[PDB]
Structures are given as structure tokens and as C-alpha cells.
Amino acid sequence: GFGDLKSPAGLQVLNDYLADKSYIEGYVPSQADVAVFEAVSSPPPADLCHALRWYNHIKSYEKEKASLPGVKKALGKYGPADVEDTT
């Protein structure tokens, strides 16, 4: 997980995670993108370049969100592995 996606430090983890990525999972948009997106809720600060870039990209997909492949997971399952993880 990224932690609290409505806090700065969480957005910093989301940003660092997106430095070498265009999507949350893989190389095409998925439901993984939609869930983190809805959790961020509002455009990250521009200084979090990779986070904001990814935000504007997924936002361009909002009109067709449910059509995106994959299935929603718990926010903790996205991004960096949590060392202490259930399941």
C-alpha cells in the first residue's frame, strides 16, 4: 500500500512508485488505476510530477472506468508490498 492516499507522505510514496511507471499495474490502465485514483480524490501537487502525470492520464479514462479490465482490490494490495500483510 501507499499508506493514506489523502496525506502528503502517501502521495510521496505514490509519486516515487510512479517514477518508472505509467500505471499502478502493468503497462495498460486497469481497475487498479481506478481504485487508487478514487482514493487520491484530487490532483496531486505539481511537485509530485509522476503522481500528477498519472492522475491526469487516468482522469482521461473516467468516462469509461467500469470498462477497464481487472478487479478492484484492497488499497493495501497496490504498489509496494507491505511487509506485514494479511492474506
Binding site: 517514477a19 518508472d20 482521461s60
Partner: protein
């Protein structure tokens, strides 16, 4: 609707790749004839394509077009071409940038590793700096963008990727490309799109400079 015809080229031509990747997006049914060779000099070929260049395209309706960017445009769709005049101007921008700014110094640097050229340690090193400048420009542009035009792949990304293909494969070793993380993220994303992948195959970034 979508174009249908024959694409004459030599095998694994990065210039033909532009039109083959675009066709994957559009649904254009493009046949490749490669195994040919010096057939570009046959009289018939010359009529159809006086330039004698490849790649060259002959539609099933007799329509012929003989330059790489033009074949890719033709077998593309509105989305790749640019749906608005702004988007379409931006496509032309990156295509022309690829042709004028990337192709020559990439040629000067790469051909020697390939042996196609003659190595002039000054020219080759200046070409390096040129490429570095290009990578840098792409990197700063892509800091806020996933793709070059709009929020979808266009002829811009397709053209630039194929143009940078040989650099990334043979010469842009990790130590060299680390100064441009956004261009590399963009490059990896692009070549991993299903459409790119069906043409390029798995693309291995240069581990060690050639």
C-alpha cells in the same frame, strides 16, 4: 474504411515498424513482403515508387505511397493522426522532430557500432551529446505527460519510439540513460503496449554499450 495492401521492406526495418504498429491500432490489414531484396530497382517498382526507397506501400486498390511517415499516416486512424488540428499539428511536430533531430546523430553514433559508417571519435562523441540533448528534451516534456500528444498513443509516440529503437537496443546502456528516467518510463510503456509488442517483440535495453 481502413487501408488494405502490401508493404515492401527489408526484414526488421524500424521505418516499416512505424506503419506496422499504427496498423495494429487502426485495424488496417497490411501485408509485408520482405524475403525481395534489391527488388526496389525493378522497373515496375520504380514506376510505382520512383524514389527507389523502402518502405513502400501498394494498396489493394492500386494506390501507392513511398515514404515511411506517409505509409504510417495512411494506415493510421483519426486518433493516431490527431483528432483536432492542434493534436494533428503536434503529431507532425514530433514526427518532423524525429526525422530532423534524432535520425542523423543516432545514425552517426550507431552506424559505427554496426560498422555501417566510419568512426570519427569527435563526430561520434558529438552525436552522443546530441542524443543526450534529445533524451533530455523528451524527459522534461514527458515529466507531466504519459504520451507525447493528448492522453493516448499517437503517430508521435510510434514514430519517436521506432526512431529511438536502435539507440535503446544497442547503445543506451544504463549508466547513460539514467539521467532521463521519464523518457525511459515512456519508452518502456510504449514498446509494452500490445500494439507495439506485436511488431517489436520483447525489447531488451542495452546492457552494455556497443
Amino acid at each position: 474504411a481502413m487501408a488494405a495492401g502490401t508493404l515492401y521492406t527489408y526484414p526488421e526495418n524500424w521505418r516499416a515498424f512505424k506503419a506496422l504498429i499504427a496498423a495494429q491500432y487502426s485495424g488496417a490489414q497490411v501485408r509485408v513482403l520482405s524475403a525481395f531484396g534489391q527488388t526496389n530497382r525493378t522497373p515496375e517498382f520504380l514506376r510505382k515508387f520512383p524514389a527507389g526507397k523502402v518502405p513502400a506501400f501498394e494498396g489493394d486498390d492500386g494506390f501507392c505511397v513511398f515514404e515511411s511517415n506517409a505509409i504510417a499516416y495512411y494506415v493510421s486512424n483519426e486518433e493516431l493522426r490527431g483528432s483536432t488540428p492542434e493534436a494533428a499539428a503536434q503529431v507532425v511536430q514530433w514526427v518532423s522532430f524525429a526525422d530532423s533531430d534524432i535520425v542523423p546523430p543516432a545514425s552517426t553514433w550507431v552506424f559505427p557500432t554496426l560498422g555501417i559508417m566510419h568512426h570519427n571519435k569527435q563526430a561520434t562523441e558529438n552525436a552522443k551529446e546530441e542524443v543526450r540533448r534529445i533524451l533530455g528534451l523528451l524527459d522534461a516534456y514527458l515529466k507531466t505527460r504519459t504520451f507525447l500528444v493528448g492522453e493516448r498513443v499517437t503517430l508521435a509516440d510510434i514514430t519517436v519510439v521506432c526512431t529511438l529503437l536502435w539507440l535503446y537496443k544497442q547503445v543506451l546502456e544504463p549508466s547513460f540513460r539514467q539521467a532521463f528516467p521519464n523518457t525511459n518510463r515512456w519508452f518502456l510503456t510504449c514498446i509494452n503496449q500490445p500494439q507495439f509488442r506485436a511488431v517489436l517483440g520483447e525489447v531488451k535495453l542495452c546492457e552494455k554499450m556497443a
